[PDB]
């Protein structure tokens, strides 16, 4: 196989904007004997986020466009995309749970993929249908809810992986769980201590969550 030739490829692909080839090469490198160097880790993080992101965006728009006869095609078009969505998330939610989380014996990485898991189940949670919805909205809670606690006993708020979490896990409430009180709370909180107390990354995350309470 040659592990670092796939890394060598995922670099090139990204530097070529065609992001599927990119997630493929990484999907590969992780379905190897994991413990993805942060580099690879992000590459993977970036690539997969681009595809599933690409789908979300398209899904959103098309839902509103749908949600008439034009509508059934809107529907048909939606499902087509939802699928593509689901298969991407089903795909990354694998590597995470089956290679990543268990092949990252370090706190940093621990809290990370636990966001990712949550991030993805969350996407799967928007796009849902019946009780499967509840099944996946819950699977996301626990996953987000497991590193918040992990970040919490292993490293600081002024660190972007935790701050970030707070943001996203906070948002898990508005868009998803319907607990604005908890979202806002979590955001005021994780923002709060952030201030208490390298440079940029934190700062950035730090604003966005505020920017967010400005909404809620």
């Amino acid at each position: 196989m040659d592990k670092n030739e796939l890394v060598q490829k995922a670099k090139l692909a990204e530097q070529a904007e065609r992001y599927d080839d990119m997630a493929a090469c990484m999907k590969s490198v992780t379905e190897q004997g994991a413990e993805l160097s942060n580099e690879e880790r992000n590459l993977l993080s970036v690539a997969y986020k681009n595809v599933v992101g690409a789908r979300r965006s398209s899904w959103r728009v098309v839902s509103s466009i749908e949600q008439e006869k034009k509508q059934q095609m809107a529907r048909e078009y939606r499902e087509k995309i939802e699928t593509e969505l689901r298969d991407i998330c089903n795909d990354v939610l694998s590597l995470l749970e089956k290679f990543l989380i268990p092949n990252a014996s370090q706190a940093e990485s621990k809290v990370f993929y636990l966001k990712m898991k949550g991030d993805y189940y969350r996407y799967l949670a928007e796009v849902a249908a019946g009780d499967d919805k509840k099944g996946i909205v819950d699977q996301s809670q626990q996953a987000y809810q497991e590193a918040f606690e992990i970040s919490k006993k292993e490293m600081q708020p002024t660190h972007p992986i935790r701050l970030g979490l707070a943001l996203n896990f906070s948002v898990f409430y508005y868009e998803i769980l319907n607990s604005p009180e908890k979202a806002c709370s979590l955001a005021k909180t994780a923002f709060d201590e952030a201030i208490a107390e390298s440079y940029k990354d934190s700062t950035l995350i730090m604003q966005l969550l505020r920017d967010n309470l400005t909404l809620w």
Binding site: F112, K115, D119, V171
Partner: peptide, 5 residues
Amino acid sequence: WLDLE
């Protein structure tokens, strides 16, 4: 770095 929205 991490993920953001």
